[PDB]
Write a protein that binds this ligand. Structure first.
Ligand SMILES: CCCCCCCCCCCCCCCCCC(=O)OC[C@H](COP(=O)([O-])OCC[N+](C)(C)C)OC(=O)CCCCCCCCCCCCCCCCC
Ligand SMILES: CCCCCCCCCCCCCCCCCC(=O)OC[C@H](COP(=O)([O-])OCC[N+](C)(C)C)OC(=O)CCCCCCCCCCCCCCCCC
Ligand SMILES: CCCCCCCCCCCCCCCCCC(=O)OC[C@H](COP(=O)(O)OCCN)OC(=O)CCCCCCCCCCCCCCCCC
Ligand SMILES: CCCCCCCCCCCCCCCCCC(=O)OC[C@H](COP(=O)(O)OCCN)OC(=O)CCCCCCCCCCCCCCCCC
Ligand SMILES: CCCCCCCCCCCCCCCCCC(=O)OC[C@H](COP(=O)(O)OCCN)OC(=O)CCCCCCCCCCCCCCCCC
Ligand SMILES: CCCCCCCCCCCCCCCCCC(=O)OC[C@H](COP(=O)(O)OCCN)OC(=O)CCCCCCCCCCCCCCCCC
Ligand code: SF4
Ligand code: SF4
Ligand code: SF4
Lengths: 154, 386, 95, 318, 69, 95, 176
């Protein structure tokens, strides 16, 4: 009953947070720190976060850089093609809320005007370690999901 | 048939996003029409609403692989308009970190070029070296990338005690890392098949198309701004300018690898010739005073107050100042109207003219070659779009 | 090769037997033995080993409970108190 | 007992493929000065399990397919054929001892391109069909040299029975008399399985906007298992062909251990090679086949017809 | 360290070891403790059919020797 | 029989793994080119002559080795001439 | 001064020609590349065990902001607005009035951490070491709103991190 649903949630949550395949939108300088998270010192692959992931095989989108108006429709399209469950990590001030270019005529003031965001990673850029802290924070967010618990009580 | 290239590869990439609209006939590329502006953020307009100091961090975020070199270009332009001179120790520090920045850029340029062509492994080896150089940035400025360290008048702070010893230990082993990279690529027949005779550009065309840096020297043009129009203390260091002979991707790759070796050679002289003294110009109407002075002397407090609110006024005038940035000639056309905010700041990004030549360089090549040609130009769209 | 195997066995003994050895393996994915530098008031334990290369020469084994939260499996970097934050990030040499 | 025997072949294959993914990531990791999976389970031993569960509960991609029949056929053909190539392999005893086992493997592998063709045909995307046609053209091209090389080697064996390759190599590995053919065989298996530096399907689809997966996560995992089952199988076959293991009839398990070790090492060399080289251009790997391997294989096929006759080393027919 | 790659290799090695070991053991179990007879050609098949007749229990692998003379 | 049973199991399992993988996860609610034709045709014509070469391991047992060796070499040479003809006529180009 | 990176004549003597034919046919330079990746397989990796191990940082590191106090507990900030004037991103918003005891103190002090570029100009500009960038970098949040810091949050950051902040300033203030 409730015990079986509770453990199934743990199993599927464990599988999903242990196999987070990211689609990186390397838009600007924040993408450089993202590359350093893949580099040997941090090796995001060792957490199960694969290096190369196709957008249709992805579970998390990382918005790493400034989002311009010219680019916003293309970013939304990639998000819409992501199979679920899908999560968005906003990395850096530009993606978080426009940052240094907040008052620009050509810049989206935060990617959360285009897509829902799960984690906001602050910094300009956030260090590779700060990004990794954010990814680990998303994993614990997935760990708290109770999808089957909610479904059982419907 | 018409075809559009993807915004970016499926692995982490930090060059930005490009919409490449191509015309193909079979395997061959007949037309290339890059559609940019995907990272256009109106930097040049935003600068007009900033003081000269407030605008300096914008230059970290142009070619965001060559941060301190972009800072140097802007600092030199303002110093020229201000008619002041940074102290000798600051100039040596600027050259030292300018060449550390060149190493950072050339690792990114060479290894991501290889990574996009399918040679993934060198990217990982050399980005550990980049991580150690990020630590030098962080130890002088508190930031791994956007240091905002080089400023008009000199540098923000003096090197912490013990930093130069660590830069020596790093430099001592770096040429071995380059050798390992060359072992993987230089003589590899697959690498040579992907680069030799690809994207040939003649010396005459390279000049007329506005090319600079390695895009000129790969074609045999003997030109390097550090040699011909030296700035800071580049006239006081010895190094050789690598020159290509075929004007293709392979020669440009060899030029970049050899430039890394020359950067180590320059860093070695900087570590030994570093002089003592102050690290920013001793003119408190331009460079803020020391914090202890600001908290004790009435004049220092006033000048600190005014430099951080109004900022220094710059005499009216216009300058085009350029440096040999790792990607080529990086310049600023800076217009001062006499106030503390620049009237106009046009940024000359070397990758702008290089990318405009993609259609010319890709003629008679196949689709997979377009990836190689973009890599050999070393394009970052922060500086292209601004 | 036998001396490497001995050091492998020493780690099991150095973590208080198999049960303690397995606990750190599954909590921290690392079974190295270091010198105990100290323990903060929340239960975090700080170790050093200066034969390791720079970066791996200091580490913290997080407490299993902090501020009423069960942190046996769920740990994060914000659990390090500021007085140890400086030492763990090598901003200083003195704990 | 036979149905049990089939299961003791199929199920271990799928588990090996699952854990080849872990091994590939960790071996590539250490050659890249990093670690690879070491959190999900000890030393990453639960990483394949997490990946498997994750992929099968992922939302399935909506299939905008122009042919439902060929859309479901392709993964079935790929996975069924992959499992079928294992049934004549002598390890040291085959599940089915076939007199013409080499021809069976040659004939069954020639059908593998139908899953590539049917999947692209069903994709209902011009970009997917072009990629499928490019992948087929590369596959069939390298089938040519694989067949001729295999025939040349059999002129020292005298038979189409796979178990006879064990007898042929009782004194000496066939890599000694046939290392020029071994080198071209090894590279041809890389190109046949679309492995780096011949991974043009993955390479090209990355560039082209509109050349996507078109299969849901679960069905796409079945394609991946089929591909990796083939990678292990091709390296088991390479070991049998060129590094023959001595068989003791009373201690068959001794053969299995040694032959397993060789197969693992050959499989890891595929990972070793992936970590070391850039990718070929499509026209460049076609030239490698048609203008290099094929001329050399033809001359070596002529040589290996003549050599047993001129040395008086013709093998027995049985 | 590199030897941390071995556990995955060892697991992979075991999975590849099982099919060959199982086939060998199942053959001995089914064939009276001997190798399964190889009959590729009509001669070998004819002798296997004859051995079935001679066994008296309809099993080719049940061998009869001088005791039947 | 054993072979057919093995074939049925392999594809039946493949059919099962595909049917449930196509159906069960649905329960969880939330410019013709002449160059490419000619490589295919060239593969076919080379494949046919590979068919004529397959019996060679059995042909080497003949008492008529003189004829067998001549015809074997003759067949492989005509393959080499076929490749040479395509090569010299730019049938293996991509530009 | 310049040098040629690729201007060499291959020797055409038979020995040299046969060295190149051996390289072509026997893949010697490809084998050499395999040697390099094999040697890396047996090197200790550079990976650290985050979050149990951390990347090294210096006292100058620019992290999360905090508002500081004097040893007596009085706020250091006297609402001069130099940080707000210099901020390149206009991330700082300040209002001030005379405090009930007559002190010059802020009634609003906001930092929009999603506008901020983490440049450290505010702490350079501050004349009384009131606003600093602390050493913390692990403060990612689940909502955008959590990154709009008001004065209470910044004072709480100061009280939370003062032990580390004070030591870092002690380490670097003679370079300023
Ligand atoms: C098919 C069989 C599936 C086997 C399930 C394997 C689960 C293993 C596992 O959860 O690891 C322990 C995990 C590991 O804990 P963790 O993943 O939360 O964190 C481990 C510590 N770090 C991340 C710092 C390294 O324990 C759990 O968190 C509980 C989840 C249990 C899921 C199994 C459901 C039954
Ligand atoms: C091999 C191929 C087969 C592998 C198995 C893959 C298929 C597994 C079954 C998945 C469908 C289950 C249907 C559940 C229906 C349901 O309760 O609603 C979903 C509910 C939906 O939530 P909801 O009902 O509250 O609605 C959501 C809100 N709306 C509708 C508005 C969007 O929960 C889920 O979404 C998660 C369901 C996860 C199902 C987990 C099944 C048990 C664990 C599976 C382990 C798989 C092991 C794989 C082993 C490795 C591969 C062999
Ligand atoms: C007594 C008389 C007896 C008669 C017989 C005598 C024989 C004498 C001749 C012996 C030498 C024959 C060698 C045959 C091997 C094939 C050689 C070959 O094809 O190499 C050429 C090919 C293309 O090289 P390229 O530089 O482009 O040449 C210019 C072409 N226009 O280059 C390549 O193929 C390179 C392939 C690139 C991909 C390689 C990636 C992996 C490489 C490492 C694997 C090492 C091999 C491991 C073998 C394992 C076997 C189990
Ligand atoms: C150049 C780089 C290579 C790149 C290509 C990749 C090649 C990888 C090669 C992997 C296989 C190498 C051989 C593996 C060694 C394992 C040997 C073993 O386990 O058994 C011992 C064996 C000798 O015994 P055996 O093989 O049975 O010979 C009897 C003749 N029939 O063996 C004795 O030593
Ligand atoms: C040890 C005893 C012997 C000792 C002495 C040595 C004797 C043997 C060596 C002498 C043999 C003669 C050498 C013949 C090779 C030279 C042929 C040649 O030069 O062709 C090269 C060239 C193709 O090159 P490519 O760049 O691809 O295209 C042309 C662009 N210029 O031009 C072409 O267009 C090539 C077109 C023809 C290619 C022929 C392909 C034949 C097919 C392979 C058959 C191999 C033999 C039978 C099997
Ligand atoms: C594989 C493991 C790594 C081995 C170490 C690499 C090495 O030492 O080889 C380098 C050696 C020198 O070759 P190179 O520097 O390119 O100069 C031209 C030829 N002297 O080059 C060599 O000696 C490699 C020789 C390779 C021999 C051919 C292998 C054929 C495999 C099938 C048998
Ligand atoms: S937040 Fe900073 S580092 Fe990131 S893209 Fe914007 S300016 Fe660049
Ligand atoms: S760090 Fe820079 S951008 Fe951030 S609040 Fe201070 S002055 Fe403004
Ligand atoms: S924080 Fe410092 S600079 Fe900013 S208003 Fe307060 S006293 Fe002035």
């Amino acid at each position: 009953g409730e015990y079986v649903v509770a453990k199934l949630d743990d199993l599927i949550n464990w599988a999903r947070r242990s196999s987070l395949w990211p689609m990186t939108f390397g838009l600007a300088c924040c993408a450089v720190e993202m590359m350093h998270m893949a580099a040997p010192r941090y090796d995001m692959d060792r957490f199960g976060v694969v290096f190369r992931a196709s957008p249709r095989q992805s579970d998390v989108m990382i918005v790493a850089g400034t989002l311009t108006n010219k680019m916003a429709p293309a970013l939304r399209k990639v998000y819409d093609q992501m199979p679920e469950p899908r999560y968005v990590v906003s990395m850096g001030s530009c993606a978080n809320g426009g940052g240094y270019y907040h008052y620009s005529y050509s810049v989206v003031r935060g990617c959360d005007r285009i897509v829902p965001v799960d984690i906001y990673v602050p910094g300009c850029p956030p260090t590779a370690e700060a990004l990794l802290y954010g990814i680990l924070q998303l994993q614990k967010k997935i760990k708290r999901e109770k999808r089957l618990r909610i479904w059982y009580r419907r | 048939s018409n075809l559009t290239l993807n915004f970016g590869p499926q692995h982490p990439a930090a060059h930005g996003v490009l919409r490449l609209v191509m015309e193909l006939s079979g395997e061959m590329v007949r037309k290339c029409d890059p559609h940019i502006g995907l990272l256009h953020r109106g930097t040049e307009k935003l600068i007009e609403y900033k003081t000269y100091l407030q605008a300096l961090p914008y230059f970290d975020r142009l070619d965001y692989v060559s941060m301190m070199c972009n800072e140097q270009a802007y600092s030199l332009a303002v110093e020229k308009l201000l008619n002041i001179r940074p102290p000798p120790r600051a100039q040596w520090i600027r050259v030292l970190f300018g060449e550390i920045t060149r190493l950072l850029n050339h690792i990114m340029a060479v290894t991501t070029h290889a990574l996009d062509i399918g040679a993934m492994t060198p990217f990982f080896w050399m980005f550990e070296e980049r991580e150690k150089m990020f630590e030098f940035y962080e130890r002088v400025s508190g930031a791994r990338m956007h240091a905002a360290y080089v400023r008009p008048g000199g540098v923000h702070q003096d090197l912490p005690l013990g930093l130069m010893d660590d830069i020596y230990e790093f430099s001592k082993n770096f040429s071995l890392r380059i050798d390992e990279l060359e072992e993987m690529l230089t003589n590899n027949r697959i690498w040579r098949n992907r680069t030799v005779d690809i994207g040939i550009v003649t010396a005459e065309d390279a000049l007329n198309y506005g090319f600079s840096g390695v895009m000129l020297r790969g074609s045999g043009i003997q030109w390097d701004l550090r040699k011909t129009q030296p700035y800071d203390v580049y006239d006081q260091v010895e190094f050789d300018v690598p020159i290509g002979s075929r004007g293709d991707c392979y020669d440009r790759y060899l030029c970049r690898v050899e430039e890394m070796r020359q950067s180590i050679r320059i860093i070695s002289q900087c570590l030994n010739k570093m002089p003592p003294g102050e690290i920013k110009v001793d003119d408190a109407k331009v460079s803020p005073p020391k914090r202890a002075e600001m908290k004790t002397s009435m004049e220092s407090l006033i000048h600190h107050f005014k430099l951080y609110t109004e900022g220094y006024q710059v005499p009216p005038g216009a300058t085009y100042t350029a440096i040999e940035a790792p990607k080529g000639e990086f310049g600023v056309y800076l217009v001062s109207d006499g106030s503390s905010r620049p009237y106009r700041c046009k940024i000359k990004a070397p990758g702008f003219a290089h990318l405009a030549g993609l259609d010319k360089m890709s003629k008679g090549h196949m689709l997979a070659d377009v990836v190689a040609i973009i890599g050999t130009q070393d394009i970052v769209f922060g500086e292209v779009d601004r | 090769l036998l001396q490497v195997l001995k050091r492998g066995l020493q780690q099991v003994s150095g973590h208080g037997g198999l049960r303690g050895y397995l606990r750190v393996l599954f909590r921290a994915n690392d079974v190295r033995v270091g010198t105990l530098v100290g323990e903060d008031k929340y239960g975090n334990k700080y170790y050093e080993d200066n034969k390791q290369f720079f970066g791996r020469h200091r580490w913290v084994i997080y407490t299993t409970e902090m501020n009423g939260k069960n942190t046996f499996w769920d740990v994060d970097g914000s659990m390090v108190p500021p007085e140890w934050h400086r030492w763990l990030h090598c901003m200083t040499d003195d704990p | 007992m036979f149905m049990i025997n089939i299961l003791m072949l199929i199920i271990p294959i799928l588990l090996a493929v699952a854990f080849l993914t872990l091994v590939e990531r960790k071996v590539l990791g250490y050659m890249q000065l990093r670690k690879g999976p070491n959190v999900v389970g000890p030393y990453g031993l639960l990483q394949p399990i997490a990946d498997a569960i994750k992929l099968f509960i992922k939302e399935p991609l909506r299939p905008a397919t122009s042919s439902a029949s060929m859309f479901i056929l392709a993964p079935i053909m790929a996975l069924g054929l992959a499992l079928t190539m294992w049934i004549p392999l002598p390890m040291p005893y085959p599940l089915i001892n076939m007199n013409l086992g080499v021809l069976f493997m040659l004939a069954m592998s020639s059908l593998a391109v139908y899953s590539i063709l049917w999947s692209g045909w069903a994709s209902n995307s011009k970009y997917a069909l072009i990629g499928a046609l490019r992948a087929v053209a590369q596959t069939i091209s390298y089938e040519v040299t694989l067949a001729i090389i295999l025939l040349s080697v059999l002129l020292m064996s005298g038979s189409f029975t796979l178990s006879t390759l064990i007898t042929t190599q009782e004194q000496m590995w066939l890599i000694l008399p046939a290392w020029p053919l071994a080198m071209m065989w090894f590279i041809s298996t890389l190109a046949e399985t679309n492995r780096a530096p011949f991974d043009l399907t993955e390479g090209e689809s990355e560039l082209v906007s509109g050349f996507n997966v078109e299969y849901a996560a679960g069905p796409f995992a079945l394609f991946f298992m089929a591909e990796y089952a083939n990678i292990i199988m091709m390296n088991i076959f390479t070991a049998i062909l060129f590094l023959g293991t001595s068989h003791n009839p009373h201690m068959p398990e001794l053969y299995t251990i040694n032959f397993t070790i060789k197969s693992l090492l050959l499989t890891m060399s595929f990972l070793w090679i992936r970590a070391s080289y850039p990718r070929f251009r499509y026209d460049q790997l076609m030239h490698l086949l048609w203008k290099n391997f094929l001329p050399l294989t033809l001359a070596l096929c002529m040589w290996h017809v003549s050599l047993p006759i001129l040395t008086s080393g013709i093998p027995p027919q049985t | 360290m590199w030897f941390e790659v071995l556990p995955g290799i060892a697991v992979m090695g075991v999975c590849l070891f099982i099919p060959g070991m199982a086939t060998a053991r199942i053959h001995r179990f089914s064939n009276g403790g001997k190798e399964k007879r190889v009959a590729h050609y009509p001669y070998q098949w004819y002798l296997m059919e004859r051995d079935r007749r001679v066994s008296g229990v309809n099993r080719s692998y049940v061998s009869k020797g001088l005791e039947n003379i | 029989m054993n072979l057919m049973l093995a074939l049925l199991t392999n594809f039946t399992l493949a059919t099962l793994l595909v049917i449930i993988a196509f159906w069960l996860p649905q329960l969880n609610v939330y410019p013709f080119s002449m160059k490419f034709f000619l490589v295919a045709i060239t593969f076919l014509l080379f494949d046919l002559e590979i068919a004529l070469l397959l019996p060679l391991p059995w042909a080497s047992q003949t008492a008529n080795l003189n004829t067998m060796l001549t015809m074997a070499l003759f067949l492989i040479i005509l393959l080499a001439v076929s490749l040479a003809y395509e090569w010299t006529q730019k049938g293996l180009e991509w530009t | 001064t310049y040098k040629y990176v690729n201007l060499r004549e291959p020797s055409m003597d038979m020995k040299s020609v046969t060295d190149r034919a051996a390289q072509t046919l026997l893949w010697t330079e490809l084998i050499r590349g395999l040697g390099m990746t094999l040697s890396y397989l047996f090197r200790e990796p550079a990976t650290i065990n985050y979050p149990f191990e951390k990347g090294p940082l210096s006292p100058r590191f620019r992290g999360e902001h905090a508002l500081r106090r004097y040893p007596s507990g009085e706020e250091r900030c006297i609402a001069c607005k130099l940080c707000e004037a210099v901020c390149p991103a206009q991330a700082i918003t300040i209002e001030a009035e005379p405090r009930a005891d007559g002190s010059r103190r802020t009634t609003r002090y906001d930092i929009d951490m999603t506008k901020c570029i983490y440049c450290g100009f505010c702490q350079e500009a501050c004349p009384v070491d009131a606003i600093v960038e602390g050493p913390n970098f692990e403060f990612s949040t689940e909502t955008h709103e959590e990154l709009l810091y008001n004065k209470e949050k910044l004072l709480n950051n100061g009280d939370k991190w003062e032990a580390e902040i004070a030591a870092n300033i002690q380490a670097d203030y003679l370079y300023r």
